[PDB]
Amino acid sequence: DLASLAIYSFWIFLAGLIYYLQTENMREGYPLENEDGTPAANQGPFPLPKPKTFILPHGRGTLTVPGPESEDRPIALARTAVSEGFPHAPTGDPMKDGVGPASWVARRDLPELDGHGHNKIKPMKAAAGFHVSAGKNPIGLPVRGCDLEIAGKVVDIWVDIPEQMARFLEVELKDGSTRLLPMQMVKVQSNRVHVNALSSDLFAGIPTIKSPTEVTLLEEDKICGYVAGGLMYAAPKRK
Amino acid sequence: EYQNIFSQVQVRGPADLGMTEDVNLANRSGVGPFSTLLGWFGNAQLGPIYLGSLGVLSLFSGLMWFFTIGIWFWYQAGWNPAVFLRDLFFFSLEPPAPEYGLSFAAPLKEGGLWLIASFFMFVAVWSWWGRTYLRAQALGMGKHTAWAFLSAIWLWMVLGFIRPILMGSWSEAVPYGIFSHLDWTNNFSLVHGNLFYNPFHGLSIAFLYGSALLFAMHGATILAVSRFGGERELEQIADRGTAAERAALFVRWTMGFNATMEGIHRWAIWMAVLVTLTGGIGILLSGTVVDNWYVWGQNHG
Amino acid sequence: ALLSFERKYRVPGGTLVGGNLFDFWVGPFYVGFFGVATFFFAALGIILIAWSAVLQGTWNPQLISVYPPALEYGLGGAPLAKGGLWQIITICATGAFVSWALREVEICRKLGIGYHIPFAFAFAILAYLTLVLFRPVMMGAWGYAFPYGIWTHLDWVSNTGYTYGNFHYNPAHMIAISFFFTNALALALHGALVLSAANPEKGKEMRTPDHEDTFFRDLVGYSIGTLGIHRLGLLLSLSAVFFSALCMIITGTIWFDQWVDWWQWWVKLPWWANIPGGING
Numbered sequence: 001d002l003a004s005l006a007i008y009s010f011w012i013f014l015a016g017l018i019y020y021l022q023t024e025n026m027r028e029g030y031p032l033e034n035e036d037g038t039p040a041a042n043q044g045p046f047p048l049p050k051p052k053t054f055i056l057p058h059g060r061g062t063l064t065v066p067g068p069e070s071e072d073r074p075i076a077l078a079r080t081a082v083s084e085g086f087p088h089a090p091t092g093d094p095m096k097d098g099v100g101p102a103s104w105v106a107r108r109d110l111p112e113l114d115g116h117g118h119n120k121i122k123p124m125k126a127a128a129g130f131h132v133s134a135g136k137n138p139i140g141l142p143v144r145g146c147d148l149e150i151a152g153k154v155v156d157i158w159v160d161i162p163e164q165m166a167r168f169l170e171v172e173l174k175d176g177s178t179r180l181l182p183m184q185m186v187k188v189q190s191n192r193v194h195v196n197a198l199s200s201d202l203f204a205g206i207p208t209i210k211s212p213t214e215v216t217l218l219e220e221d222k223i224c225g226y227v228a229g230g231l232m233y234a235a236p237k238r239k
Numbered sequence: 240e241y242q243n244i245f246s247q248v249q250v251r252g253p254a255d256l257g258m259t260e261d262v263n264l265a266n267r268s269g270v271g272p273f274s275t276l277l278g279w280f281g282n283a284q285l286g287p288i289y290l291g292s293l294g295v296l297s298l299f300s301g302l303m304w305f306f307t308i309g310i311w312f313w314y315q316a317g318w319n320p321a322v323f324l325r326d327l328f329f330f331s332l333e334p335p336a337p338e339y340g341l342s343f344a345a346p347l348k349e350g351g352l353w354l355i356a357s358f359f360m361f362v363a364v365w366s367w368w369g370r371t372y373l374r375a376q377a378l379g380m381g382k383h384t385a386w387a388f389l390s391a392i393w394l395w396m397v398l399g400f401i402r403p404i405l406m407g408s409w410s411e412a413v414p415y416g417i418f419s420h421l422d423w424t425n426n427f428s429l430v431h432g433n434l435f436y437n438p439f440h441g442l443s444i445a446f447l448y449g450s451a452l453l454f455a456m457h458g459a460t461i462l463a464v465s466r467f468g469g470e471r472e473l474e475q476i477a478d479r480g481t482a483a484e485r486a487a488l489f490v491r492w493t494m495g496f497n498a499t500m501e502g503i504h505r506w507a508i509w510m511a512v513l514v515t516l517t518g519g520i521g522i523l524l525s526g527t528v529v530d531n532w533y534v535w536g537q538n539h540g
Numbered sequence: 541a542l543l544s545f546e547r548k549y550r551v552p553g554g555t556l557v558g559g560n561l562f563d564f565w566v567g568p569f570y571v572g573f574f575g576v577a578t579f580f581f582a583a584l585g586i587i588l589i590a591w592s593a594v595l596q597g598t599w600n601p602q603l604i605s606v607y608p609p610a611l612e613y614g615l616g617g618a619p620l621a622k623g624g625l626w627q628i629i630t631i632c633a634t635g636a637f638v639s640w641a642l643r644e645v646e647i648c649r650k651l652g653i654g655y656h657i658p659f660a661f662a663f664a665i666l667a668y669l670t671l672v673l674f675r676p677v678m679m680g681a682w683g684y685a686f687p688y689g690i691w692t693h694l695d696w697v698s699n700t701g702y703t704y705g706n707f708h709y710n711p712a713h714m715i716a717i718s719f720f721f722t723n724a725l726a727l728a729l730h731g732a733l734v735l736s737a738a739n740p741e742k743g744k745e746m747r748t749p750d751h752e753d754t755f756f757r758d759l760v761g762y763s764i765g766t767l768g769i770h771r772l773g774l775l776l777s778l779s780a781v782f783f784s785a786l787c788m789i790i791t792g793t794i795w796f797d798q799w800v801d802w803w804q805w806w807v808k809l810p811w812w813a814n815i816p817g818g819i820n821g
């Protein structure tokens with residue numbers, strides 16, 4: 001009868017759908033590797049999908065996925081065991097080397113652009129006429145680390161022009177240079193900005209930007225990575 | 240430790256008039272006010288809205304549906320405002336009785352006002368559908384939103400149009416009433432031998448529960464990786480960052496699944512559309528092909 | 541095996557218990573202490589369900605059903621064959637769920653990400669514990685809990701519902717349904733919008749979040765934004781399950797009559813209670 005045919009057709013449809021969905025979610029990170037970086041024998045049940053090509057706007061070329069995958073950076077890690085499936089110990093400073101929760105990806109060393117081809121993120125001093133509209137204005141507040149030492153002061157907000165939101169605080173250090181801090185890793189309080197991830201002495205180590213009025217996707221990753229990694233790696237100095 | 244559910248600081252710039260592409264700018268309004276209240280959770284800007292021909296047709300048509308019901312609710316309240324507010328949930332615009340079949344010949348006071356209201360609702364939804372398609376075309380975007388919305392239209396069309404026609408009377412349709420449409424829903428299940436035995440109803444539920452599981456996980460994840468600009472999903476698709484890598488690895492280490500930044504949005508659209516897709520098939524087959532889901536379930540077929 | 545990018549993330553640390561003792565992977569799966577706890581509690585609970593199937597005299601998955609103790613046992617222990625297995629399995633299921641959440645916490649710490657996912661999951665665990673623990677303890681017997689079986693748990697929903705008339709009339713249930721419906725509408729739109737931008741008309745460049753904001757402003761005059769939709773999704777879905785738990789914690793406890801009759805508080809308010817005509821006059 002009709003209902004049995006409908007329900008049976010449906011399960012065949014759903015099985016094709018799940019196949020399609022599984023292979024669509026293999027377009028990044030395949031093929032699988034052994035810990036030594038050689039291709040793994042067992043790639044799983046589904047095969048790699050046929051490549052697809054994104055045409056990036058503003059003349060920035062094309063991406064093809066799946067496509068050739070390399071880290072394009074050295075990984076300062078060593079095996080802790082003689083068999084598959086154990087942790088890899090940092091061989092240096094994991095904060096400096098960009099491993100574990102301090103990891104960054106070699107994204108394009110260009111800034112993300114808005115729909116008009118202008119830099120997406122600018123310091124508020126260069127964005128007419130962006131202002132703080134609500135909440136405490138953090139500009140001028142001292143910045144405290146998790147060791148409860150003062151590390152610097154806020155000298156600007158870097159705003160997303162098209163989405164109208166704060167993304168980074170620009171912080172002046174004791175030596176007069178600045179760093180970006182991600183907005184999602186600070187507590188704006190009435191009389192200070194508190195940073196749990198970093199102790200005062202790790203602020204100088206935040207990766208710097210090559211130009212002072214723009215930040216690139218690569219720089220965002222190095223900065224965000226470094227600050228997140230402090231949760232694990234600066235735990236000795238947190239109170 | 241800040242969680243990123245509400246913004247700590249709002250910033251505001253000049254009103255954003257939006258991208259142009261092939262949009263007829265003659266048909267965009269001016270910007271509305273900026274809500275600081277809204278701006279704690281998302282964007283502060285209201286407007287501009289686009290209103291061309293289909294917009295006004297849909298808006299006029301949809302208000303006529305809304306007013307047609309309300310005129311009938313006032314009539315039932317004997318025009319007393321105290322009785323209108325007391326009995327609001329209990330009023331109902333009922334379809335024509337079974338006698339009148341699929342005829343447009345029923346009197347206003349016994350189903351004609353229902354048909355009028357339904358006509359206005361029909362125009363309102365379909366014009367709004369063309370509008371979701373055309374607004375996407377003007378911006379050169381995929382038609383994903385229009386095709387996903389059709390899934391919702393499928394169940395609404397089954398309930399009020401396609402099924403009443405196959406059964407041979409408008410009496411089988413849904414009344415316009417708060418408590419009365421609830422009673423209809425409960426009544427429907429009893430008359431068809433309990434929908435829990437309808438395998439399509441079972442799947443519909445699986446997808447509804449799964450829509451909640453998936454948006455819970457997806458939202459939670461993007462907030463968990465917003466410290467690496469994770470909500471910037473398009474640039475993470477074009478150029479995988481540590482946000483996409485950490486999101487992928489959470490899923491892999493937890494339950495051995497693969498998830499790409501693009502791929503999770505394919506899971507999302509399908510989990511959702513399959514709710515009303517399977518739903519409408521389950522309702523279509525009820526009383527047309529299957530009297531009684533208990534009895535069907537005993538034979539399996 | 542590893543994703544191309546995975547090795548740099550597989551560092552030591554993040555565990556809540558055991559230091560480096562369980563700090564390893566089996567294929568893609570992180571283990572940790574709560575991986576071991578999850579396996580123990582799951583294996584034990586599956587053993588006990590098989591034992592339940594023996595006693596009942598059926599291996600069919602569509603028939604196996606593990607029932608709570610009958611009402612006359614109240615909140616006491618019960619013989620295995622008559623509700624005691626349900627009791628031990630419920631402890632096992634609770635242990636497996638909480639272990640799974642704390643394991644997600646360990647994974648979050650190693651990856652240096654927020655704890656939003658295990659937090660979101662804690663609401664599903666809350667809903668489960670409402671049905672099998674909080675409501676039954678407040679009502680005075682384990683027997684008010686639902687049975688573990690595919691079709692029998694649906695009978696329990698149907699019977700529990702219709703004890704209070706048409707359960708649609710539970711006002712917390714109306715709110716919960718609204719959040720479920722709205723969640724699914726929002727998930728459809730979010731998926732469609734991101735895919736419409738990444739996958740534009742043939743031969744065209746990828747769109748921008750500006751196009752996404754613009755499309756929604758054009759359509760409905762407001763756009764919540766790329767951060768806002770993720771906040772909204774988390775909130776709609778968490779709210780759906782909060783009001784779900786609430787609608788059942790109040791049913792059988794503060795309210796045990798027909799739910800439709802509850803709505804007479806509104807109708808019998810003194811100022812319109814006696815005015816004739818309408819439906820209730």
Ligand code: BCL
Pocket residue numbers: 435440441442444445446448449452586668671686690691693694697
């Ligand atoms: C939530 C309110 C009610 C309830 C009301 C309903 C109604 C109404 C329906 C279901 C249906 C289902 N319910 Mg139920 N159900 C309840 C509580 C539960 C609990 C629990 C709390 O432990 C579980 C595990 C289930 C599981 C199930 C599935 C068998 C089925 C589809 C679920 C789904 O797709 O979700 C979304 C989750 C996903 C998509 C992720 C995948 C989850 C998989 C499918 C779960 C497999 C569970 C397995 C069969 C149980 C054995 C596991 C043991 C380790 C051996 N329900 C409570 C008591 N449930 C539907 C059905 O058709 O069943 C007859 C249905 O119509």
Ligand code: BCL
Pocket residue numbers: 363364391392394395398423424425426427428433434435439440443444447514515517518519521522697721724
């Ligand atoms: C006693 C009642 C019966 C029962 C009788 C029914 C009946 C009858 C139906 C369902 C349906 C469903 N049931 Mg049931 N159901 C029961 C018990 C359950 C239980 C449970 C016990 O836990 C659950 C979880 C469900 C869950 C569900 C859903 C999966 C499904 C509806 C999906 C949906 O999104 O529709 C909501 C979405 C829509 C209705 C589409 C609307 C789209 C239109 C175009 C929007 C127009 C808006 C308009 C213009 C107004 C504008 C508003 C303003 C602008 C804001 N049922 C019991 C057994 N159930 C439906 C289904 O699919 O069945 C298979 C259905 O018809």
Ligand code: BCL
Pocket residue numbers: 424425637664665667668670671696697698700701702706707708713716717720781783784785786787788
């Ligand atoms: C005839 C029946 C009555 C009715 C009686 C009831 C009763 C009784 C209940 C509901 C409940 C609900 N009803 Mg009702 N309800 C009716 C009609 C409806 C209709 C409709 C369209 O008519 C809708 C849309 C709903 C919707 C709903 C939801 C608000 C709610 C279920 C969701 C939930 O609690 O998730 C919560 C989610 C869970 C409990 C799942 C938790 C998952 C756990 C933590 C993990 C499981 C892991 C698993 C074992 C792993 C699987 C193995 C792996 C594969 C390895 N009802 C009719 C009128 N309804 C229920 C509720 O609110 O419960 C609190 C409830 O008890």
Ligand SMILES: CC[C@H]1c2cc3[nH]c4c(c3C)C(=O)[C@H](C(=O)OC)c4c3nc(cc4[nH]c(cc(n2)[C@@H]1C)c(C(C)=O)c4C)[C@@H](C)[C@@H]3CCC(=O)OC/C=C(\C)CCC[C@H](C)CCC[C@H](C)CCCC(C)C
Pocket residue numbers: 448449451452453455456459493494578581582583585586629632633636637640644657658660661663664687688689690693777778781
């Ligand atoms: C709160 C919003 C929604 C939500 C969210 C949510 N669910 C989640 C998460 C989140 C955020 C996770 O992080 C977690 C996950 O990893 O997802 C892949 C998960 C998860 N939600 C799941 C299921 C699930 N969620 C549901 C619901 C919901 N989850 C809500 C609607 C439902 C419904 C609606 O029924 C189900 C079935 C899993 C896929 C996973 C949790 C897996 C887990 O806890 O594993 C440990 C336990 C085992 C491996 C099994 C042990 C089995 C027992 C010892 C014996 C059996 C006892 C059981 C009572 C039998 C009853 C069966 C009968 C009723 C048929």
Ligand SMILES: COC(C)(C)C/C=C/C(C)=C/C=C/C(C)=C/C=C/C(C)=C/C=C\C=C(C)\C=C\C=C(/C)CC/C=C(\C)CCC=C(C)C
Pocket residue numbers: 305306308309310312354357358360361395396397398399400413414415416417420
């Ligand atoms: C305060 O007073 C004012 C004046 C402001 C008015 C107030 C109005 C009020 C209070 C209105 C309230 C309205 C309510 C409560 C409405 C509720 C509606 C509900 C719950 C709807 C539920 C389901 C509806 C469905 C499924 C309808 C489906 C309809 C169709 C598929 C259309 C079918 C079309 C038909 C039959 C005719 C088509 C004709 C031709 C020729 C093709």
Ligand SMILES: CCCCCCCCCCCC[N+](C)(C)[O-]
Pocket residue numbers: 135245246247276277279280
């Ligand atoms: C869902 C749309 C509406 C959301 C509005 C919620 C307002 C929240 C206000 C937060 C208060 C500000 N604070 C103290 C967190 O900085």
Ligand SMILES: CCCCCCCCCCCC[N+](C)(C)[O-]
Pocket residue numbers: 268269270271285286287288760761762
């Ligand atoms: C979510 C619903 C939001 C609807 C808000 C619509 C804003 C429209 C802007 C009104 C301004 C009109 N005008 C002609 C003065 O520019």
Ligand SMILES: CCCCCCCCCCCC[N+](C)(C)[O-]
Pocket residue numbers: 018438439440441442445449509510
């Ligand atoms: C997007 C695909 C996700 C897969 C979800 C599948 C859930 C299985 C539902 C089992 C219910 C089957 N039943 C009893 C209705 O026939």
Ligand SMILES: [Cl-]
Pocket residue numbers: 778779782
């Ligand atoms: Cl909440």
Ligand SMILES: [Fe+3]
Pocket residue numbers: 457461472504730734770
């Ligand atoms: Fe997203």
